[PDB]
Amino acid sequence: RVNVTLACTECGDRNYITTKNKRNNPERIEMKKYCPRLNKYTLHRET
Amino acid sequence: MLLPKRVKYRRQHRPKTTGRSKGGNYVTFGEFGLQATTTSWITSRQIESARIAMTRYMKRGGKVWIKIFPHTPYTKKPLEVRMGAGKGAVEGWIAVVKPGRILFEVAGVSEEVAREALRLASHKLPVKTKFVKREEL
Amino acid sequence: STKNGRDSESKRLGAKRADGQFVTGGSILYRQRGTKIYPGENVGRGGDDTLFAKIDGVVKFERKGRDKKQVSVYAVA
Amino acid sequence: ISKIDKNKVRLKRHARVRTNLSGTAEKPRLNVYRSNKHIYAQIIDDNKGVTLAQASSKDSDIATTATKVELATKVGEAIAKKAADKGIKEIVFDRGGYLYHGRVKALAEAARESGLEF
Amino acid sequence: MKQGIHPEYHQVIFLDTTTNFKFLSGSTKTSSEMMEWEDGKEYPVIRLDISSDSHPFYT
Amino acid sequence: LKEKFNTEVTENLMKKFNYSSVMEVPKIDKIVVNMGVGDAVQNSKVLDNAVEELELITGQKPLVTKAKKSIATFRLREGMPIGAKVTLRGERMYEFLDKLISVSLPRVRDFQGVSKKAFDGRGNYTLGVKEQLIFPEIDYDKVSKVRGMDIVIVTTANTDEEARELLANFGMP
Amino acid sequence: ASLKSIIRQGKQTRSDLKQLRKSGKVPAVVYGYGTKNVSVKVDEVEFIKVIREVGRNGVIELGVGSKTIKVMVADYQFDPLKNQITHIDFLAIN
RNA sequence: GAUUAUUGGAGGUAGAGCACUGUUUGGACGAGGGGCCGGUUACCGAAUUCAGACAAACUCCGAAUGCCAAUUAAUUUAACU
RNA sequence: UGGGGCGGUCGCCUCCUAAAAGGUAACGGAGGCGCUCAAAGGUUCCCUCAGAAUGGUUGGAAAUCAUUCAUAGAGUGUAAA
RNA sequence: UCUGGUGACUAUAGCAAGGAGGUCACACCUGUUCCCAUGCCGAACACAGAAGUUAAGCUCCUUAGCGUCGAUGGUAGUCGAACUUACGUUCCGCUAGAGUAGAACGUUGCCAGG
């Protein structure tokens, strides 16, 4: 169990901290989240 | 020697002695009985002594019922040591009886024998007692 | 020694407003675990199972069925 | 063994549904029933236990032997016109304990086509 | 009715010598040597057994 | 071959019982053919093969039952597929049963063969089967370990005498 | 089987009840079909004699004011510690 | 603001009770081990029942009083920032 | 800290003590936390206990399968309420 | 003003048992071509019909059999006061639970047919 900081590609920021467990989800996880720079839901990804 | 096979909580509050008997005030199984008249605790050895003294006088004759069971444990610190380092260890088991409570019942024996046997039992107990029969009317 | 000296901070549960008094539109009415009291008219239910008023009015505790109770709020004024 | 009845199960499911479902005279309830052959529709304002409009497959205004489904379509059109006089605005569709499929779905789509605001 | 995962069963001609028990089906689809019309016009694979000739009880 | 039963509705029952109407008549409802435990601590492929055998026996894919608990005295937990079953209702039921009654006792080799009474008083049988009369279509050619089966015939009956009246129709009482 | 009774007036308090019990009386009720519910008093000794002569489950034609009522005993509150009766309910069988 | 009267409401104490949990005394009933050849005979543990008992960490029930508050009315003089 | 010492404890959560609002002490009586989950979260549809016998291939007597009562005694990630 | 649909009332409404009924309704019923579907199955859901039945469900009637409700009177406990120190007493007020008599085999709003 560890923390994770997501990062957008176009919003140019990282303001979404989530948590995951390595052994069950070792790969980087990606989701759709609303970053308000672009004012739309965009694809954030673990980094 | 009477005690429960298990209890949820070993250490308990000491019971209450004010009031009258909630129940168990009438003979139901036998012909004669010993009713209490004052209040006290009975300590599970007194019962044994009374039962023995009442059994041998009847000489494997009639039948005896004990209407009382000590459910409640009481604690004791072994040596008189400082106050207050936790509650002590279990020492015995008690039943509480209030006036009206029937303690022992007997059947299958004559009235005078019942009276004498229950007298011998009463002299082994910490409470005043009284001989009684089945209620009628 | 002993090993029994623990307890938690008591939470101030129970009724916070009475049957018959006026309240405002976000006031707490009953804090509890689970649903001892259910919500009725113009009454909400929060994540802590807390009961609150949606609008301004007088509060009425009443039965729900045979063995349940609820609160309601009515906007008479 | 024993065979279960269907309508009591339907009523359990319908009671579970109708916990956030009620009429308020501007979003009234559109209750539906079907036994084996016909279908019945009733508009209700649950605040007073009052109903406003009624329709059925055996109503002589609409009664044939077409499909058992176009019949429900006609019932939808009929109750829609009946409520067009008053309270034809956005409403709430109470499906009973029935799926939104087949006769009920057809009835609802007909009601929507006939000008209702749901 | 979920097509694809079930086996293949068909009313083969189960014409036994004893009573012609043509009330079976399955994957015993032998060469259609006999297609009885009263029975299934299908494989005669269930053609002879000890079914209805001599039972332990009803011999 | 359903018309046999359709005639037996009155050939024996309306006579022996004299029903007031035709609908108060006993009637087969479902056939459950549950195989058995076969503890697959390592025999998972064996249970798969047994499932294939049941697919050959019946015209329906079996549904596989997992352990409902983690019962001690056995190495298992919740999950762990340790059973299989099929439930038959109509045409498959009759097409299976007309074959089964034909090929059972000649392959069972017993006069009584089943029981005088294995019922609960509600129209249920609880028949145990040693797995030889079954697969009369693809016989013992490749399989290695024999199996056992547990079949039940749940009907509309409410007692054992009506079940016996029905077992009069191709049964071994 | 010919008991008497006196009717209790309204609002008997604890003190008067225990005075009545210090005396040889005992409170009682009469209910059942044929009459409404009435609260009365009875002499304990006479009631005991009637019970001795008639039996526990027996009938008594007791007098209430102007009239008489055939009646059976329903229940009785009894004090086992001083062996006296403290209340008795009468049921009109008619 | 305070006291009282009349009303409404939250709550599970004293007391009672055994409907859940656990503790218990007699009695029956018949089933499993058992004394034996897979079984009789007695004895065990369990279940179901009959009647009686126990409980701070049991409750099918449930006060008195205290608590909150009312279009609130009558007597008093506090109350708040 | 029922002198001090040795011993034990030091934060948080849940019961009882606690006196039917809330609150309430002891080196009073019982137990837990220092997380876990990418589904064990959201929404839409469907579904419903064990236990008990009944009875049977298996049979631990009971595992799976089947009818009926069962009133949450089922189950609810994690203590208790 | 019979049935049905849909709502409000703490089961006085339920459970159990016994007896009657049906194409205006209700239902079991026939089947899986199509919509759709069963961690297998048209059992269920869904679909197309109306050959057959009142047997079952459902409706009506009867019973207080189980369950439910439940007074009066009395008791326990208790507020206040006065005795007092008794495992208490007395006076005043509130009056429980259990049990008993008894009640009840549902009341009623809206709508369409009849």
mmCIF file of C-alpha atoms (C1' of nucleotides) in Angstrom, chain I residues 11-63:
data_model
loop_
_atom_site.group_PDB
_atom_site.id
_atom_site.type_symbol
_atom_site.label_atom_id
_atom_site.label_comp_id
_atom_site.label_asym_id
_atom_site.label_seq_id
_atom_site.Cartn_x
_atom_site.Cartn_y
_atom_site.Cartn_z
ATOM 1 C "C1'" G I 11 -2.598 8.671 22.210
ATOM 2 C "C1'" C I 12 -7.322 6.894 19.782
ATOM 3 C "C1'" C I 13 -12.063 3.627 19.233
ATOM 4 C "C1'" U I 14 -16.284 0.583 21.580
ATOM 5 C "C1'" C I 15 -19.372 -1.482 25.802
ATOM 6 C "C1'" C I 16 -20.486 -1.584 31.494
ATOM 7 C "C1'" U I 17 -19.674 1.310 35.850
ATOM 8 C "C1'" A I 18 -23.310 6.015 34.740
ATOM 9 C "C1'" A I 19 -28.339 6.704 38.968
ATOM 10 C "C1'" A I 20 -34.392 5.898 31.666
ATOM 11 C "C1'" A I 21 -31.532 13.845 28.253
ATOM 12 C "C1'" G I 22 -26.231 15.024 27.776
ATOM 13 C "C1'" G I 23 -21.968 14.697 30.923
ATOM 14 C "C1'" U I 24 -19.549 12.121 34.988
ATOM 15 C "C1'" A I 25 -13.938 9.298 38.788
ATOM 16 C "C1'" A I 26 -10.640 5.262 40.604
ATOM 17 C "C1'" C I 27 -3.441 1.340 39.875
ATOM 18 C "C1'" G I 28 -12.593 0.085 38.459
ATOM 19 C "C1'" G I 29 -14.492 -4.456 34.927
ATOM 20 C "C1'" A I 30 -13.998 -6.209 29.443
ATOM 21 C "C1'" G I 31 -11.956 -5.764 24.436
ATOM 22 C "C1'" G I 32 -9.736 -3.534 20.032
ATOM 23 C "C1'" C I 33 -6.789 0.513 16.493
ATOM 24 C "C1'" G I 34 -1.533 2.531 14.648
ATOM 25 C "C1'" C I 35 -5.417 -0.485 8.551
ATOM 26 C "C1'" U I 36 -7.473 -2.650 4.273
ATOM 27 C "C1'" C I 37 -10.074 -2.373 -0.718
ATOM 28 C "C1'" A I 38 -9.263 -0.445 -8.135
ATOM 29 C "C1'" A I 39 -13.717 -3.423 -6.167
ATOM 30 C "C1'" A I 40 -14.859 -4.620 -0.531
ATOM 31 C "C1'" G I 41 -16.174 2.406 -4.287
ATOM 32 C "C1'" G I 42 -20.670 4.839 -7.743
ATOM 33 C "C1'" U I 43 -25.064 3.709 -10.459
ATOM 34 C "C1'" U I 44 -29.067 0.232 -12.896
ATOM 35 C "C1'" C I 45 -31.168 -4.266 -12.482
ATOM 36 C "C1'" C I 46 -32.178 -9.050 -10.236
ATOM 37 C "C1'" C I 47 -31.723 -12.453 -5.746
ATOM 38 C "C1'" U I 48 -32.289 -13.838 -0.268
ATOM 39 C "C1'" C I 49 -31.270 -16.674 6.279
ATOM 40 C "C1'" A I 50 -28.513 -20.307 8.831
ATOM 41 C "C1'" G I 51 -29.910 -24.325 12.209
ATOM 42 C "C1'" A I 52 -33.453 -28.159 12.248
ATOM 43 C "C1'" A I 53 -35.018 -32.508 10.887
ATOM 44 C "C1'" U I 54 -36.694 -35.087 6.560
ATOM 45 C "C1'" G I 55 -32.660 -39.014 2.986
ATOM 46 C "C1'" G I 56 -30.360 -40.315 0.354
ATOM 47 C "C1'" U I 57 -24.126 -42.117 -4.230
ATOM 48 C "C1'" U I 58 -21.127 -40.314 -1.483
ATOM 49 C "C1'" G I 59 -22.309 -40.301 3.838
ATOM 50 C "C1'" G I 60 -17.166 -37.272 8.847
ATOM 51 C "C1'" A I 61 -23.769 -39.187 11.932
ATOM 52 C "C1'" A I 62 -23.097 -33.730 9.280
ATOM 53 C "C1'" A I 63 -18.986 -31.480 3.389
#
